Design a protein around this ligand. Structure first.
Ligand code: HEM
Ligand code: HEM
Ligand SMILES: CC(C)(C)OC(=O)N[C@@H](CS[C@@H](Cc1ccccc1)C(=O)NCCCc1cccnc1)Cc1ccccc1
Ligand SMILES: CC(C)(C)OC(=O)N[C@@H](CS[C@@H](Cc1ccccc1)C(=O)NCCCc1cccnc1)Cc1ccccc1
Lengths: 450, 450
């Protein structure tokens, strides 16, 4: 019963168990599962998330066909998941013409011109991050990066998307911060996908109605009271053609809070762990920042893009830690791409974590070597093997904003502080075996003032 | 032979002559021909440009279906014309997926953010226009508007699209101005459409190879030597997906020189004729400009959009003089829209001039009444009866730039000069019976200094 698909197609893979499929192999998580399957089976393999067949591909030509060439026609939507409730209008969750409509209505929001207008706002809380770090640096005590970076990442969101100016580390009782931090169920949905329609008619949603109703009623207070923020850029858009609905506008805001707060703060903790365990990379980066920005000059939009070694450090960290881990597209038609037939309903998956650490494409893939992305070596990197933001029409729409936000934080922090490991700094860093790419133990480092 | 199409469909219209069709009725031009056909036949009618059937529509619901609803699927391209040569890659001439590709690659070029960056450049030559007008104002002599406005409109193009700073009125020998002013055949093509492929294989083009080869070799001098100009915004775009080709990039530049130089200068001459023949409209506009910009303050992007009466004067002039005169779409499939069958190959036409002067939609349509577009009355205007920039996915892509350019010129001119008619001022203004909406005799007015 649906477990003989890859058997008939002649595709290798682990033998699935009834009902469960291959989900028991997730005990070490999927990044360790994708690496093992990439070795035992080769270029392609197939497993089952319960009854859902998943076809993994690693050929760069075939990846380009799925992500770019046959996107609008075949591989348009991602794996369906629920219950979402009213959040079906989210751009990352929307499907077919509904997504292509929202992707068009939100594309001008992420241009370089709008991002350059957001830099003064993002740089404002970079100084707040330094002041909070200095209070932890002048008092000798190891700092938890996920708490000090999460406070910064939240500060950027509340202003760049709603204009609410809060010091999350010093103002927790503000209704916005208290609700945006709210903010076993999912492995059950993986094995019980026939219970998603039950939770939808029961009005259960993966987001608590506490936060959504607050954000829905907080946005209408901001909309009816009213710039440079994502909210105003979406209000001006509603003034495919059919304009952004009121409910759709709030659904996109919540998606921007999830990614911006948790991706930006988690990658910064990964970067600072690599910079602390490699003092040579941190010193060379601090020398480039001081050369471009002397006398601790404030970073601007142009000065950030001028730093090449900073971009090399960010790109190398995203290679070791691609937080998305996997890229997925649902096959909607019986299509044959690159001489391989893919039936309808099969979930095509790209193991980004496994491809980023593949020794056949990277020399010493486990080492932190920023020289891979130097201007002399960046050309020999396949853009479909290294996909930290995906690829194609449905790649990360906030790639430029996320890169600009993290670099503005790293510049202002490395201008004032040098980071060194502690005795309790878990070296080497072990990744969590859950559903999010995060360190097992939180990263703790010693912050010293320059 | 192809002259019995509207006869079979039951569509009224003038009886066509063999070979010629109804082109002999163009002796008074098409705007007088569209008005007469709108009266004798009613809401729809059909005539023949030689052997080419042309179906005219005036119903606002059916116009929306052609221009917006059934654009990408049916009414996508305009009437084919030649010989164009390498200019087939022009966005206004491109067809089907080629146009939709160029429309996407050039859409971010015309955003409000890029236009706001062009205002300091456009406002620079507004002062040049005042200095040249003052030299003609201090010496009492009637000024020809088409020569003083054409000098300004050319000055805006050479800078906003290539960065070349020239005073066209004072520097005619510059290779750019001398070539951009270079810059019976077409009625023959209308009756002889089977000679277009002959001129294409003979390498004859509607543009002289003198200018095109110069512009093609002048752009490559500018490209290989290198901001804020249309050229750089297109160079950054090439750095549908498949990037702007080198030849395609030059073809779009020539199209921008045609529209920007000749539309902007011709509408300004129409506006100043209406302001001179209506001193009350000119005084009220000069009072609004002085109220927003006291002490002859320079106009900015925000201060231009703040002037409502200035927008009312511009919109009313474009009603009396829609320079495009007609909107045309080629019917590519046998489609039935709004209960009317339209065969394949028929040219659907929207008589913008006739609709703008239709007494059934406008009270006293021949009078210059800017109060029609007031904020209290602008709501009762159908956006598919008043189409000075077209409508739908293939409307005027430079609408915002053209409106901002003309208003910046009117503000800086009306800040320093008051315009009064002369004895040789042809009142009332008679339109030319040619192919371009221009006054028969050039508009001459008296310029006095404030
Ligand atoms: C280090 C930071 C980030 C990384 C590495 C990252 C990575 C990714 C990846 C891999 C995808 C899927 C691409 C694909 O399926 O081909 C994605 C999608 C997306 N990302 Fe990000 N992201 C980051 C931060 C952000 C931020 C700050 C935003 C702010 C709005 C954002 C908004 C989105 C959206 C809306 C989508 C879905 C787009 C669509 O489905 O059309 N991401 N991101
Ligand atoms: C008073 C000034 C102008 C007026 C009234 C005007 C009007 C129009 C109209 C009526 C159309 C056809 C719309 C349709 O077929 O539905 C058009 C097309 C177009 N206009 Fe303008 N125009 C003006 C100036 C400009 C300027 C300054 C540019 C600068 C680039 C420009 C670029 C274009 C282009 C590229 C197209 C064709 C777009 C396409 O085919 O996709 N126009 N214009
Ligand atoms: C672990 C498990 C697979 C059981 O579960 C999920 O991880 N489930 C997701 C569902 S679909 C998601 C789209 C998306 C998927 C994968 C990677 C990026 C994006 C979505 O809709 N938004 C995500 C927010 C935007 C973002 C995040 C990270 C990087 N770039 C952008 C995740 C999800 C769903 C709903 C709300 C938040 C997160
Ligand atoms: C009088 C007659 C019909 C025999 O002839 C033409 O009038 N022929 C045109 C051909 S198609 C044109 C697209 C277009 C058509 C009509 C109105 C606007 C645009 C084109 O391609 N570009 C035009 C330049 C952009 C522009 C102009 C005016 C207003 N807004 C934008 C005109 C033409 C062709 C080639 C080069 C220049 C002009």
């Amino acid at each position: 019963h649906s477990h003989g698909l890859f058997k008939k197609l002649g595709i290798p893979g682990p033998t699935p168990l009834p009902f469960l499929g291959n989900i028991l192999s997730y005990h070490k998580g999927f990044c360790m599962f994708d690496m093992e399957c990439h070795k035992k089976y080769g270029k392609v393999w197939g497993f089952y998330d319960g009854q859902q067949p998943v076809l993994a591909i690693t050929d760069p030509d075939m990846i380009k066909t799925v992500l770019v060439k046959e996107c609008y026609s075949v591989f348009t939507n991602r794996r369906p998941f629920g219950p979402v409730g009213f959040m079906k209008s989210a751009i990352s969750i929307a499907e077919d013409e509904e997504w292509k409509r929202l992707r068009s209505l939100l594309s001008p929001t992420f241009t370089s011109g709008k991002l350059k207008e957001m830099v003064p706002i993002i740089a404002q809380y970079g100084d707040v991050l330094v002041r909070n770090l200095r209070r932890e640096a002048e008092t000798g005590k190891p700092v938890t990066l996920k708490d000090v970076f999460g406070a910064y990442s939240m500060d950027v969101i509340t202003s760049t998307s709603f204009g609410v100016n809060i010091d999350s580390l010093n103002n927790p009782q503000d209704p916005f911060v208290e609700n945006t931090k709210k903010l076993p169920f999912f492995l059950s949905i993986t094995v019980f996908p026939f219970l998603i329609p039950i939770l939808e008619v029961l009005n259960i949603c993966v987001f608590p109605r506490e936060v959504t109703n607050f954000l829905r009623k907080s946005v209408k207070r901001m909309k009816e009271s009213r710039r440079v923020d994502f909210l105003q850029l979406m209000i001006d858009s509603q003034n495919s053609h059919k304009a952004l609905s009121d409910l759709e506008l709030v659904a996109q805001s919540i998606i921007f809070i999830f990614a911006g707060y948790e991706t930006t703060s988690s990658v910064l903790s990964f970067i600072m762990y690599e910079l602390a365990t490699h003092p040579d990379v941190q010193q060379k980066l601090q020398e480039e920042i001081d050369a471009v920005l002397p006398n601790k000059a404030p970073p601007t939009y142009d000065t950030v893009l001028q730093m090449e070694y900073l971009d090399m450090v960010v790109n190398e960290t995203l290679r070791l830690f691609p937080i998305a881990m996997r890229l997925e597209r649902v096959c909607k038609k019986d299509v044959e791409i690159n001489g391989m037939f893919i039936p309808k309903g099969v979930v095509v998956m790209i193991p980004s974590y496994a491809l980023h650490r593949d020794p056949k494409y990277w020399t010493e893939p486990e080492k932190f070597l920023p020289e891979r992305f130097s201007k002399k070596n960046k050309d020999n990197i396949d853009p479909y093997i290294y996909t930290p933001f995906g690829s194609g029409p449905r790649n990360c729409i906030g790639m430029r904003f996320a890169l600009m936000n993290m670099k503005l934080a790293l510049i202002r922090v490395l201008q004032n502080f040098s980071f060194k490991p502690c005795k309790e700094t878990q070296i080497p860093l072990k990744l969590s075996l859950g559903g999010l790419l995060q360190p097992e133990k939180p990263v703790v480092l010693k912050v010293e003032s320059r």
